[PDB]
């Protein structure tokens, strides 16, 4: 009797691991895709060809985009 309820408790947080995978999959993906739209924003902004400037702001944008979806 006790055995076969476990499978629908097993399936129950089977689905929890799905939600965690779903969470990180789009949290990373929205971190890249919004940064690329922020990447072309610098090409239309006027940053003077300086790799340190278009990497720090490029990185700092990625920090915000991952933080916004998670919280």
Partner 1 sequence: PKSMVIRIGAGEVGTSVSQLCTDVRKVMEPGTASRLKERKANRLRDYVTMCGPLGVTHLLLFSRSTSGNVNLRLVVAPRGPTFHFRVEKYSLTKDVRRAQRHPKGGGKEYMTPPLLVMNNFTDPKSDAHSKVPRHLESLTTTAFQSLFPPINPQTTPLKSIRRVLLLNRELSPENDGKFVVNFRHYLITTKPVERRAVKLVELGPRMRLRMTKVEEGLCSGKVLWHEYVSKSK
Partner 2 sequence: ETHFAFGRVNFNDGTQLSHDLTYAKSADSEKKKKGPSDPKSALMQLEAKKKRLEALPEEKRKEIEEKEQWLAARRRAEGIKVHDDESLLKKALKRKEARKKKSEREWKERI
Partner 3 sequence: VRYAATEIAPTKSARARGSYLRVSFKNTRETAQAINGWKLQRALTFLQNVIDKKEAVPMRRYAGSTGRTAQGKQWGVSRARWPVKSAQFLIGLLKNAEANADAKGLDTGNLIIKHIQVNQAPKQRRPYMSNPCHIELILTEAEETVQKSEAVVR
Interacting residues toward partner 3 by CB under 8 A: 48-52
Determine if 70 is a binding residue for partner 2 (CB under 8 A): yes
Minimum distance between the CB of residue 21 and partner 3, rounded to whole angstroms? Answer: 31
How many residues appear in the chain? 71
Determine if 21 is a binding residue for partner 1 (CB under 8 A): yes
Could you tell me if 7 and 33 are in contact, meaning their C-beta atoms sit under 8 angstroms apart?
no
Q: Give the contacts of 65 (CB within 8 A, at least 6 positions apart).
A: 30, 31, 34, 35, 38
Q: Which is nearer to partner 1, 1 or 16 (CB)?
A: 16
Residues 34 to 53 in contact with partner 1, rule: CB under 8 A? 35
């Amino acid at each position: 009797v006790t055995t076969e309820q476990i499978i629908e408790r097993e399936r129950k947080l089977r689905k929890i691991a799905q939600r965690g995978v779903v969470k990180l999959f789009n949290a990373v993906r929205a971190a890249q895709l919004k940064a690329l739209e922020a990447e072309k924003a610098a090409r239309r902004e006027g940053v003077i060809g300086s790799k340190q400037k278009e990497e720090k702001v490029t990185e700092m944008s990625r920090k915000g985009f991952l933080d916004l979806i998670a919280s």
